[PDB]
Amino acid sequence: ALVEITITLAATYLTYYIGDIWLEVSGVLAVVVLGLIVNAEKTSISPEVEVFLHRFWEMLAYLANTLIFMMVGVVVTQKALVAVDKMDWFYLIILYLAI
Amino acid sequence: DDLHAHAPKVIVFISGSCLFGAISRSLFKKLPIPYTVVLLILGAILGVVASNVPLVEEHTRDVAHMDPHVLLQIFLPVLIFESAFAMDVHTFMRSFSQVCILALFGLVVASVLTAVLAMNLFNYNWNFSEAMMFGAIMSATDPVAVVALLKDLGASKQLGTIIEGESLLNDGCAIVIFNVFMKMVFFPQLTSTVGQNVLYFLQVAVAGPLWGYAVAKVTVFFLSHIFNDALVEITITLAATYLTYYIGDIWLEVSGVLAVVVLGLIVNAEKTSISPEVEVFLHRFWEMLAYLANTLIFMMVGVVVTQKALVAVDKMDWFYLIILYLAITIIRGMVISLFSPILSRIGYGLTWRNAVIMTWGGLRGAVGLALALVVENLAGNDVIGSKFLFHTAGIVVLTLVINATTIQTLLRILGMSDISIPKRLAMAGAVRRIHEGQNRTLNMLKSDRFLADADWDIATAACEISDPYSAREFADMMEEARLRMLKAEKISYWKQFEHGMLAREALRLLVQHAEVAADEKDQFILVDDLKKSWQIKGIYPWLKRKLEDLISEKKIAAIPMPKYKLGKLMYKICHHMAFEVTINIAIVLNIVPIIMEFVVQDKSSLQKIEDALRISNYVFFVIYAIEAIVKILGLGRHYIVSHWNKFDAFILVVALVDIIIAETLLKGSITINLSSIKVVKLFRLLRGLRMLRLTKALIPKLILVVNGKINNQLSLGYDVGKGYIIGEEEVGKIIDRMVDNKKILRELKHISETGRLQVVKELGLLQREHPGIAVSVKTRQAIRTILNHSRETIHELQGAGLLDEMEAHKLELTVEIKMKRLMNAPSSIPPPPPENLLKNVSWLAGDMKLIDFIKARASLLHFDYGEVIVREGDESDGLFLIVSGLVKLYGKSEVFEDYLTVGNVIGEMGVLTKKPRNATVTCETTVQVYFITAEDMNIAIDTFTLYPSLEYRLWRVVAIRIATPLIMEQMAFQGWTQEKVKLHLERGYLVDLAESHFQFNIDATLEDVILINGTAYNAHTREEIRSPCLISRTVHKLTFQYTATEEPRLFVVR
Amino acid sequence: MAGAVRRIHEGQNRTLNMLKSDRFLADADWDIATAACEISDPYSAREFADMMEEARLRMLKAEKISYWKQFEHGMLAREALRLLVQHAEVAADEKDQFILVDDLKKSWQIKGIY
Amino acid sequence: DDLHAHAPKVIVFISGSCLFGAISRSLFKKLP
Ligand SMILES: CCCCCCCCCCCCCCCCCC(=O)OC[C@H](COP(=O)(O)O)OC(=O)CCCCCCCCCCCCCCCCC
């Protein structure tokens, strides 16, 4: 099981890194295709291994989301709120309606 | 990217390390060589390649040159916590002293000897500190392969546990000593005063475990209150581990490794708080993290060594490496042999073969490599940089190549890998049964029509499942009978455990007792003289602590309600919990002012600080005075009645005196005399005593925890006893089937019955001693059983297809949440009053009119020791309900003897059949009984004749009581557990004999029918039958006739 | 859901009676009758044509149960089960037409032509 | 540590973020 999980992790990260830096190519699309293909042919993985993998990836995504959300607040409060006018809130409302 | 853009290149290195580790693991699965050696070789090759090609250098520069702090803080906690988590905590604690002594003393002696050897033999001019660091690095072990082998061969589980615990403690202590001497060497700090050194040692050696214990308690408490959240639990575990290590090591300098070890052990022990699936996931998660860390370290060390250490090396370094390997191998064995007497005469002891296996299993691991890398990075001189890493890597490689490869051969030579003959026979039987089943399924498949063209070569590819392993008479008969009893007990215990009633610790205890009895010659398992006493005992100053806590808590039972003024309002305010909350809040607020004042004394900011402190002190004094006014008033002298309030009054008086003295200090009093004017500490230090006023609340909570622990102990003991009882019963029936030789069945049955009766009496007395915890234990068992059966019903409904997955998952989640909430329940419960006990009796339970007829009737009787409630042969004239106490029944029914306790009835059969008493019952303790007269019982039965008549319910209870032994005897190894038979009999019903001559067809649906008390006949033979007896399938048809002397009562099922 | 909750309640009552009949567990507090995890049910809260509709729905349910049992035994797979359930539901939605017309709805999979 | 010793301070931030996320998830389970 350890070998399978490590293979999945290394494959994902190597795919993204190599595709984006060397032989410049859309890394995000490659990772999307790789994930979809692995999801389709998931019978190769053992049952318990896939059961573990689902929760593992869910937890990793949760960690990433939490980190990004925590960081954005600090950065905004330290930099963006310094520069703002009375019309920016009006523009924000208009933009919300427009989108 | 352009200009100065740093694309993280560590990602490529880490991913490549993982890929190489996977390849090495897959390729060398069969070869004895560990894959870590291959990893080291690959790392060395990569380093040599990178030393020439500039491009590869950039991708192996920031990972092969990590700052030591990052390396430690990122990798050590993972390894330590994984090692602590994986271990079996209970077996480790059962022999804690042995492991502690071994680890600590052996590590110290080995490090000292290795340091002296390095100082003398080696030509390097090293001082004692460097040699001690060297020895500490070289004295750390990591026995994974040996533990795995010992586990898989299934020999000496205690040996594997001992090895694991010793390795863990060795790693912790080695890290501690290495940190101490590294600080001594690379960061000299002036002199070393005796007091400063003593304080430093006390801190590093005590504050660590305490900090870890506190963190573990808090984290476990928080985890116990999480329902339906796996991500939260996993994140909490990770954050707790890393925060513990980081905070303990950096802020409030303390041994982080020890704290993490303690936290991991504590979390492992109390892992019932975590949900099942969550813990199953956590095990694999931590295992994978540890594997990743090991792979990364092993890959890094090879590159670093090939790039730095191999540059500086002479022809004598290899000779020194060989000598050092020999010396450490000799030293480990010498230490183990020397400490053998102490840990053998006491503790568990050791055998010479076990000592040899332990000596040869000391494989160095990754902790030594990490410490060597830290040392190498901390210096720029060869005399300590190259030599340390070179020797460490050489020793690691030599150990892995030689000891790991030859451990299996060493095990074989000692003859510790043999296979027990019974295990081989069981495996052969299982394989034969599997083959028979496969052949039957193959025939069924062949008979099919849609599958006839399928190639039948699959008979070879059908997964044969080839069996592994390749390949005066009285004394022997008694040995065989003893072994048969052992096997029967093991099967009964294992069935009970699988059904979810035997628990885990109880099962281990029973299996160990059975195995020890088997090892001994001519002695039945479970002597019960003392081997079943301590668990039931639960005696230790913890009970003394409980008594002291109970005695300390004292207060006035009641206080008069004065009519002057408002009255009730003031008393309610004073006695309301709001008063206690306000007192606690005031104490907490004043605690901060005391700390601030102490810090200020020890050390316009000063003016503001002084003004704030004075204002806070005045506010706290005013609040305390108001709280005192709330009391005293109305209570009057009662306020001084409780000695506890004296401390509060003294604290308030002292605070007021200090405040008054500090406010003006001009009126007079002391003034010139030595006072707060010259030394104001007495005016502030005593303020800390106010915190002691909160101890009143601490006493109750503490009691709680103590009770908790007591409960647990008692709980376990209780359960174990029950197990044994049940087991004996099963073996009873089993003992009837086999042996077949007279004068032996007595040999087994006498011991079995004696042990059963002794355990029953012990359990009854133990319950009588502690009326509270028993109620909680019984309630918990009832809830667990009900929830288990509800979950089984939900599973059956889902399987039948009548419930979709959404509803099934909802119900399962509800059940799981309720079970988890149950796992956290009060330790003790108040025993119910007798009235509810009478109201809860099963047979009369239901209609409230019957309960009224009973409660308005009946009577309560008190008895003392040796009082004979009933005389043998005395006419049945009333019932009995044990509302408290314990009684012993003796008589002939085989002179059967038994014990009864609270919530049991006695004379049902006499009232239902008007027969003389069965056995004489005598009180073994002051007892209380409910005596319902026979005449009143007959009046009640006559009055109530609804469809579920009282007489019908009583007869149903009696019939179900009688039937169970017969059905159990029917179990001639078939397997019924003596409980599933109860459920099977529950669905039954009494015979509704409207006409005397019913012919109940004996169809396959009815299963079995029992003759409770009556005469039944066959359709053809009409053979006379007298109850009690089982009709048996021989009597094909069951006719009937109207008997006269005895009214015929039959129990039937369908 | 109501039927399942009633069945669970009946099973719990039977188990409670069995436990009460026991001897080693008589002092245990029976307040559990309330704390026994009641499992409260969620959600709070011309004749020929109708008879034919009822018969069609009964056939739908029988087919669903058969497919579910076969899949649980490990023979119906998942994609096949999804196809069968979708066909049953679509037939139920339509009026006066048995599931699995088989005219074309059971052809492409057998076809395998491209 | 002394002189130029970089104790990784990222660990504290990441662990605190995880703790705050857990607290927020637990507290607002019912709130929309
Ligand atoms: C192998 C696992 C799957 C594939 C990889 C997963 C993701 C890998 C990245 C993990 C987070 C670390 C990012 C690297 C740090 C950013 C800065 C940097 O690299 O520049 C050098 C960075 C910048 O500072 P300077 O070079 O001193 O100027 O160098 C340092 O001082 C710090 C050294 C960074 C590398 C430390 C070793 C890696 C730590 C994590 C252990 C391995 C991952 C554990 C498993 C994770 C998944 C479960």
Ligand SMILES: CCCCCCCCCCCCCCCCCC(=O)OC[C@H](COP(=O)(O)O)OC(=O)CCCCCCCCCCCCCCCCC
């Ligand atoms: C929350 C999870 C459990 C607790 C924490 C787990 C372990 C945390 C450390 C993970 C590896 C990163 C170590 C830090 C990098 C070393 C250098 C450094 O910090 O100095 C600043 C480092 C040194 O270079 P300078 O500051 O530019 O001179 O700064 C950088 O340029 C790189 C920025 C490093 C921080 C990147 C953010 C963290 C990346 C990983 C994402 C979070 C963890 C994912 C989950 C892992 C567990 C499953």
